[PDB]
């Protein structure tokens, strides 16, 4: 073949991508096809193809062509395919292409053409396909297109066409497919499409059609119609009367609000129908004379009733979607043997009867989430086929049938807060994914393969409430010591019918306050003993029942009142000490008693606060407010922990102020030295035992520290109730005054 390009036999020359600026020479006149694309031929001289009389296929892609001689293409009587894409013609070379009698395919896209001469395309009696996209056309060339009776495919995409007048294609009797997508069409005249009796495919996507066109009524042979991504809002009745042969309708991405009831009648071959956002539709459409729907979708409407004949008329219905509507009752689905997917989420369905899903033998996915369902017949799913995915989440369910669900794979139950029963593992042997309203229902299918959610962490144990043996014995040790010692201390102080000083007074209520904490641990110990190895059964009942709220109230009330009381004792000790060298007598005894009642009131208010909020006490089976995986209490928990910690410093620095103001020689023999030293230990142990609880509560706010859940659980069971038992222990063994009171009690007991 002639240099620098190659000849692919069969009278074919591949001479493209060589940067040639002119028609190559040396090629035989017997050549049938020439491809010289990707070159730099910008101007074509006259008779540039003189010595190729038998050329049938000519390609001129990407040549930066600007000017063509009118007689340049003379003698190409056998030319059939002519491509001129990616050039700068800016106008259709009507004079150059006048003599192409046998031309069949003309490609003129991507040429920045802004206008077309009226005499263009004359002599193109053999044309079948014409490409005119990617240009700057502003009007439909009615007259130039009127001279192509044999045209079959016409593309005018990606242009600036604004409107189409009447009878624009009144000659294209042989047209088959017409493309007009990605244009600026905003108005279609009534008779713009007249004469296109042979048209089959029409594309009107990405336009500005504000009203449904009535001109499509004159297209009896239409098969594919697409006008999606437009401004059409209303589709009136009788729109598709003149086109009985559609197969696919594209109308998505439209401001569709109202649809004619009858509009989609007698649409044979209609294989799909998807309508979304039609908020004004209130009645189910007629879908009559249409028995070949494969997929149906009606979302965002006001439909409240579904006709019974839906499963008696539709034959090849495969997928059904009616979500986002006002459907309240469900008709019998018997007959829809080809149905596979049903989506009915976000409706007003309240019950499921036995006959609702009798006839579905090929159902695989069934969605009923976010409804008002409160009862389901036990045999509703009995007569089902290969059901694979089921979703009835966010409902008012109280029970759940299991018959016929052995083949289930995905199941969602979240939001059914009134559902208490635990699902049996033997009824869902093929389960792989499961979500349940309460984590305690995931204990059967831990997954030891079954991503059960929410995960049953250490905070929500399945086997044992307390967990390890070491933890359990300590809580028993704490409970017995707190109950026995606090009762003893309470009795001795209040059994002496003598004058009660303020310093002795605050000791008593601290023991009383710590007694309730011992009671709180008693509830946990007995609950653990009863639910030994079977806590998952009682988990739901305990948290949701009033038992958790009562136990949770005691823990908050006993803990908060303990800090407030001993803080008052610190203030009392400082004030009583000051009055010694100043006045020598304390006369605030009545005032302190009032503050003690006020101190208890503050604890009661704090204890009752989580009761008003829903689920704050139910976050953990321990009934303790903690930020771990709980926000309702996150705002509440921080308030308490800062309040307790804040109270520490003011009651601490006053002791240092008292200690500094107290001379070292005043503690030698004064009876106040023992009293001041006893509190000095209470401020110590209570402070250190509160930091681990306090600092773990700050852990969720610090993302840089990841603490595994079981660690918080162990310390909270060993440190939070620890001060309750330790406070009386120090008093009985280390306070010399208690021994004197013990002597007084023994004498009264012996006397009585
Ligand atoms: C094609 O060749 C001409 C020769 O004058 C040159 O001016 C032009 O830049 C070339 N085009 C490309 C794309 O190389
Ligand atoms: C082509 O269109 C012109 C103008 O509408 C008309 O006069 C002529 O008869 C048409 N030829 C046909 C329809 O074959
Ligand atoms: C469907 O076509 C039949 C036969 O032409 C006609 O009788 C019937 O009324 C049509 N459907 C509608 C739109 O009612
Ligand atoms: C469906 O079309 C038939 C045509 O005869 C009509 O009688 C019927 O009322 C229509 N139904 C609805 C609800 O559009």
Author numbering: 29 to 476, 519 to 822
Authors' account:
Leucine-rich repeat-containing G protein-coupled receptor 4 (LGR4) plays a critical role in regulating the wingless-related integration site (Wnt) signaling pathway and is essential for organ development and carcinogenesis. LGR4, along with its ligand R-spondin (RSPO), potentiates Wnt/β-catenin signaling by recruiting its signaling suppressor, E3 ligase Zinc and Ring Finger 3 (ZNRF3), and inducing its membrane clearance. Cell surface-expressed LGR4/5, members of the class A G-protein coupled receptors (GPCR) family, have an extracellular domain (ECD) comprising 17 leucine-rich repeats (LRRs), followed by a seven-transmembrane domain (TMD), and an intracellular domain (ICD). ZNRF3/RNF43, LGR4, and RSPO form a ternary complex on the cell surface, which relieves ZNRF3/RNF43-mediated suppression of Wnt/β-catenin signaling and thereby potentiates pathway activation.
We purified lauryl maltose neopentyl glycol/ cholesteryl hemisuccinate (LMNG/CHS) detergent-solubilized human LGR4 (residues 1-822) containing ECD and TMD and determined its structure using cryo-EM to a resolution of 3.5 Å. In the cryo-EM map, the ECD (residues 29-525), TMD (residues 539-822), and connecting segment between the ECD and TMD (residues 526-538) were observed and modeled, except for the extended-loop region at the end of the ECD (residues 476-518). LGR4 ECD adopts a typical horseshoe structure comprising 17 LRRs (residues 58-455) flanked by N-terminal (LRRNT, residues 29-57) and C-terminal (LRRCT, residues 456-525) caps. LGR4 TMD comprises 7-transmembrane (TM) helices typical of GPCRs. LGR4 TMD can be superimposed well on the inactive conformation of the luteinizing hormone-choriogonadotropin receptor (LHCGR/LGR2) with a root-mean-square deviation (RMSD) value of 1.08 Å. Therefore, the GPCR 7-TM structure has an inactive conformation. The ECD was tilted to about 45° relative to the membrane layer, a configuration maintained by interactions at the hinge region between the ECD and TMD, comprising the LRRCT and the following connecting segment. In the upper layer, the LRRCT helix packs complementarily against the extracellular loop (ECL)1 helix from the TMD and the adjacent connecting segment, with the Y468 side chain inserted into a small pocket formed between the ECL1 helix and the connecting segment. In the lower layer, the connecting segment formed a three-successive-turn structure that interacted extensively with the presumed ligand-binding pocket on the extracellular side of the TMD. In the inactive conformation of LGR4, F529, F696, and M782 blocked the entrance to the pocket; however, the structural transition from the inactive to the active state may allow the pocket to widen, as observed in LGR2, enabling it to accommodate such ligands.
